[model samples]
Target chain A: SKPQPIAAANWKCNGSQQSLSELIDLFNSTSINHDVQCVVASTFVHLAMTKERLSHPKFVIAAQNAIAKSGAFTGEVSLPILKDFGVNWIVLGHSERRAYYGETNEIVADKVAAAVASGFMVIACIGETLQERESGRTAVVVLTQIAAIAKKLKKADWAKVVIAYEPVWAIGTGKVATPQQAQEAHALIRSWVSSKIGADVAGELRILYGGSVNGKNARTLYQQRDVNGFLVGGASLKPEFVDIIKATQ
Target chain B: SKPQPIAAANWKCNGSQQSLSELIDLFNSTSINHDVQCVVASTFVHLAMTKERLSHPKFVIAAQNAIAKSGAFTGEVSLPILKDFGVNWIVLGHSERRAYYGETNEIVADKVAAAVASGFMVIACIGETLQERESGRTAVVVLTQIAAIAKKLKKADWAKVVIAYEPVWAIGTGKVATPQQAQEAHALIRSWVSSKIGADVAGELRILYGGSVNGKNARTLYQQRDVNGFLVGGASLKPEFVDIIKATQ
Candidate 1:
């Protein structure tokens, strides 16, 4: 596989001018995996300062999310605006957005197409709830979410799209997915993508594991064949994020 | 009525680093009416720069919207964060947010209470759709929206709340309500507040008219007794915003 590992941090609804400075200092002082790309998705309010402080080639800045279109959507950050600010990546369809903000699969699909169409890389997220998993509909739910994005995107567009599988029940619940569970879900996702597109394209595709992925378990999760990297949550805000970034090393 | 007139511009989903500089320059140079307090609400991306550049006491900066709480609601600006940035005001429950973002009356009421509890002034938006107006439900709809906020607020909280009555049909449609229409709606809203609270508090509350409010019609709108000021749209971005600000003079 030619895909490089990635350690992406989602500082969900967190960051200030003061804390951002401290985070940047902590990040610079730590050694990270040169082979893996490191991206931090912060709130829109902090992206300008994040771009200014973390300007290294190895570091990428992403907007946590963006509106599907550019005009007249008040209180929304659009893809064009993100590009104008030098943001290269966007984290779309996170469970937080899907569950709380009433973002349907249709909305996420539109956002994915808009982001990819505008030349921005997308960390597309798909997940299943506790009830869905308990009812044994995990594969069905996750695949349905993936199909939504797959149908909107062209074969060429997959190059800029990275899949993030976050089990909604485990996110922020102090419950980390076991290595076996993550491997099983990730392998199924990879195979599903291969069936839709070609195995050649799927071979280079990256699928990340999200939901309570902390530094302690990052190495084990990264060791799985299909788990290309991690989309970290709570621990992403702490200094321990450096450890997660270096897990691939 | 002792309430001073207020002209607040909502630069919704607009403004860039360069354009922000231009706006600040134009705002500082243009002399405004002494009786009218001027405010501009920009997106979170621009508020920091807006705060730094438009520091004149006469000119205040506002966030287009904010989440009700301070937590892991991704892609949301919180009230505490806004306070840390020295932002004193937030615009809540615009028709755009209600129709597009699923912000129900209950959710908007929560936001108003949250903003007030955090000691931030709020421009609470209420209005009727074209369908509602045609169906003669305009008064009912506007009053219901106000009741939602009124029930959650104490009498003291009214001191920090400014009501913006924007007819959804007129906003951005190039079709504005006639002076009589604006006056009728504003009078009804003011009386409704008086009925719920008291005449004293109602008299001191500022009620601004919104919807296709431009430089030419601003003076006529200001002439209406209940139309204390305006919540401008398209004209807010142009240099003609100065004319709207000085309309009352």
Candidate 2:
């Protein structure tokens, strides 16, 4: 079994105070498996409340996104502000950000490196789109994304990073990544990291399989040699997320 | 005399909890002129704490930016979330967002429309860059920016909108807009809205001067015929921001 398997909930651009309150209640009522690590990332507006009210010490709070550093980029949250509140985990380069908001590979890399330097744990997301996958370019696309992040970080910084592979097409489209496909990609990523960085470093690194990771398939994906955990989406907003975390058992 | 002059502080991607606390204390300890409506917006991460700690009913809370509507867009704040926290003001189309983040005119309009439709007052920022001003395209450029926001809104929506005429060249460049230049641009914007949207709405509309607005110059700018108040930048974070608000006196 993997060590302290991580299950993170990305409430992604969705949630009101009422819904957040409900989710907090759900997290409080449910007992998490001892072997699992849990994370909850709410949008910026609700983060203070989420941190204050979510009653589980095991549930670490995360920011769905953050700026590379603190400066004059308007409307963006930065590491200093997050640190000010003890929000030490940041999810960088989500597919939706890359697709919609022009978060290029370089931009995400800068953020990943900055957050790591600031002593925050970063989930540096990487995956190919449907077109890239169908064209048999998944390796190149995903690797390129990973390489961008890798180029900016040091061996020491790598320790604070987790790579999340969430295929863009599968996200919220109900097209779950097949278990074999998931493992192969995860294995390929781990192998790439091991070769590029260091065997010892990559061996210790966590690779998370995201996109349509619900209760039904979490265990299978988790069983894959390199899928150390999950970065959950829609399923995370509900009680079903517990089942996904339970799959780590 | 103009009623309830608005003096808004755009934190512009800068703050720490300690800085915010000190600023909050500055606001509480200072006596504000009754005629001015003060607003303070920290970056998204600090909004919750700002709302809680800043003890001024006259000082409204605002989001520096928000998405068009609540959906699967990751890491974006939305109208519903702001409404939940009683944060009823939004600053859209700041030049930094336009230059660096690709906030097109249409994109900003969509967000402005969404927020206004959801019953929030919108500070829709419009400005011309140095090149645009140098090339004498300032009129065409700023009018076009205003046009995009205008196209999406009903006349009713215009009532809740405050246009901030912040010339990009003057922002943080220490090159403040001359009082005469500020009034001319504000008058142009107001006139454009009058002809296109309605005379009544334009008459009621407040066009606030922004960019390098500081304690020394607030009164002269506020005294301009079309300059209603200010959407402040660097000075907003300091004690002198109180002086900017006192310009209302």
Candidate 3:
């Protein structure tokens, strides 16, 4: 397969079934290209309704995150259950999870491995905080996170792994990664993978840029050599998401 | 209708859809004649499926916790959505939320008020940690929490509120609350409700005893005068959950 750019719309905790239905109707009728893979992560409450509304493989649903593997961990979603619900993709190890939920690198690795083992494409999330980035530890943090995942899986799994670099400061702050900023991070992520895993596996993998990519900057960011696509947030809720989806076409 | 007790299985982060389905199936198959109400405070990921499977008058689904109301609160489930899910119950003000997720008593009270407004039963959780309990401020802590919720809600909605006295120290720690200690806290909560709201409301309300209550001590704990029922933790996974249910009989 050639380098197919991926764009995921994370609904986070937004919208009711009525609203989501409308959004899906818009999505199904939109002029998105076949090459750009679109994923939507709705709250677990709305997954069934979203699944029903979405038509085919072009629009897949990813869980925001899931508990490690299964059994014993309370209040966490299991991979088997997500699979049972027909969820095809999941985001694991986001900066928010590590920052707020006390998700350790080890635990993040477990969740990634579990999602991968469950035969789901894993959008493994990695990012550094504002202070960490300013303090010059951005690559260190992201590399460590990827290394944790690398410890659990082989090079072949890299293709199925979509790396999303969502900087903590940029998340929900309306501050976004500049085109150069995104390009630099994605390039570094690719270089890290190539060095840690292998060049063959790294070249084949998809690396998406998150942290406030919207309609305004979507094209500029998409034009970056290393930027495979965007993990859209607020823009995902609107018709503009379709614009981003159609950008590659 | 006679007074019905309530017990909560704060499933922590445990159990997946298959496992949860198995547990609920095991529960439904058995004859649980106790007047005590049982609730499974589940992971947000499985709430809809859980509701779909366990939708009945007696069996209800509850969010572990949700945001006070709506907004751009990403990764945080909201009360409005939970209400939309037909989840008539919600667990709020857990120490976990307070310590980990930045839920203050003020925020918790808002969530309680929101839950009430949404027509969901509020299991307004309250407790002092071992330090607070050792210092003898347990009643003080519980009363303050109650006052916060009472302040937020209209007096008319007291009926839908169930006070869960889940001590911070006892939660997930095998150190069970003795019948006397449990009774003391429940009694204090009942009296506080009586004093703050009115005698009628306090007498009619159900104040549950949570914290590590399981099969072993459930008999004695359930036998307590003010301790209407248990909010079990560990043994809730096993068939003995029915045993805890039967204890209330």
Candidate 4:
């Protein structure tokens, strides 16, 4: 059997107490794929409350971002501190963080290194902007993003890591990559990693497709051999998130 | 009479469940200055839990940083989301943010503008680097930082804004500005704003001195004519934080 796919909902910058409370209840009541590892991310502020409400099987709690190290940062959640609260999963280097926040390629590498050092499982995201893809530089741009991460990571570190490829133009825009497009990107990424870290480890590496992943497209996208799972964004807030998770089965 | 001082404690990237739990308990057991408006900041991830434990009057909950706007930004605590959790105070433009994170003067101005627009109280920090101060460009550096914020703000926005002067070298360095040095910087800031916005309102502005403020130095620092209060940093995590709060009396 293939390794279990991870279907994670990134509730990016969204949710209130009532909304999340209701969603957590929905998650509890709904049956999910036992074959898939299900994950849900809340913005940092809501993690404790959100985690307290969660009472389901195969569910992992994630924080959207964290500071690379502890001490003297006014607006960051440090990995050690997150560890203290039992949040063992972190989503770092998302496209939104790269494009909007000042998180550069090297900066993202720094964060990934720190998160893994803190003994957390990491979803390290990488993708190119629309203009780069339009110019036919998608492979080069994304590989460059991954190369930065690869340089910071050891072969052993790969055991706790997942790579989510999100196209900037597609996120929150209701636009998604076709199965062929998703497969193409995933294949290229795997090939590149296999070449660098060697095939044994790269073969075990899981690459998830992100950006506008919804219930309607999840199954076909998951059917693609190289598309291991998804990092669901906006759709993560809806009941259909359960539907998307079910598709992973 | 001078307006009541705000004794704000910025915990920065510090604290865990057991540590903060005990600190909050200590805060409850300690008798803080009744005449002062006390503020305690927690990392964004800890806000919800921390707010629930607080039970004192004139006490405010602060988040170290927040995203200026809402929607689609991962890894950020947006103002509206913070408001839903009853976090009304935000510490923006902190020197740590500017020095380490990609938050620039203009970016900080954007954050301050968005924060005021969201009806939140703001502690807008500005200060010169050690090099800048050594080179005798302290006024130029800090005032330029303030000017960016001033352009984004309306005349009326000052009512909800507090400016904290934290010398870059002094923050966590165990070095502090002398009373004369502190007074000189604070006076120039107030005078500059008075010239731009007129004396009546500028006089009403509360200028806080931050960086290495301890139990011993606090009262003398507060005695400075223009130093309205303090934004305590590392000392904020200590039992001496209670003493610093007492110093405000």
Task: Name the lDDT of candidate 1.
Answer: 0.85
Report how far residue B174 has shifted in candidate 2, in Å: 6.9
Clashes in model 2: which pairs?
Answer: none
For model 2, how does the per-residue alpha-carbon lDDT over A1-249 read when each residue is reduced to its tens digit? 355578999899988888889888989888875767798998988888988898787788999998766667889877888888899998999988999889989999888988988999988898888778778998888889899999988898888999988878665566656889888898899889889889888788888888788778788888888788999988999888989888877
Candidate 3 stretches with Cα past 4 Å from truth are: A29-33, A69-74, A84-86, A98-110, A113-119, A128-153, A167-177, B9-12, B16-40, B71-74, B95-107, B131-137, B167-176, B212-220
TM-score pick, better of 2 and 3:
2
lDDT tens per residue, model 4, A109-146: 88898888888998999888777877899998999989
Fnat per predicted structure, each in turn? 0.54, 0.84, 0.41, 0.92
User: What are the per-residue Cα lDDT tens digits for candidate 1 across A1-249?
Assistant: 548988898888876778878988888766664698988988777877787888556778898888866557777777776776777799999898999899889899988998999999999999898878778988898999999999999999999999999888666566656899888999888889899798978999999998677778888888888989888877888888888888876
Residue pairs whose backbone atoms clash in candidate 4:
none
lDDT of 3 by residue, B1-249 (tens): 225877677776666656778988886677656566788877776776677776444666687777755545445577777776677787887776677556778988887887788888878878888778778788778788888888887778988888878778665566556678888778888888788788888788887777676677788887788877766677877778877877787
> What tens digits encode model 4's per-residue C-alpha lDDT throughout B163-218?
99987865556666788888889888998899988777787898888867898988
Per-residue error (Å), model 4, residue B124: 1.2
| Model 1 collision count | 0
Better of 1 and 3 by TM-score: 1
Error of 2 at B210 (Å): 0.7
lDDT at position B80, candidate 3: 76
lDDT of 2 by residue, B1-249 (tens): 464579999898888878788989889888775767888877877888888888876888899988867878889888887888888888998888988889989899888988989998889999988778778998899999898888888887788999998888766666667889988898899889888888888788888888677788888888888888888878888888989888976
In model 4 chain A, where is the ten-residue run with the lowest total lDDT? A169-178
The fnat score for candidate 1 comes to 0.54
Query: Which of 2 and 3 is the better model by lDDT?
Result: 2
TM-score, model 4, chain B versus true chain B: 0.95
**Local accuracy of candidate 1 as per-residue lDDT tens digits, B150-171:** 9999998899999999899766
For residue B164, give model 1's deviation from the true position in Å: 0.4
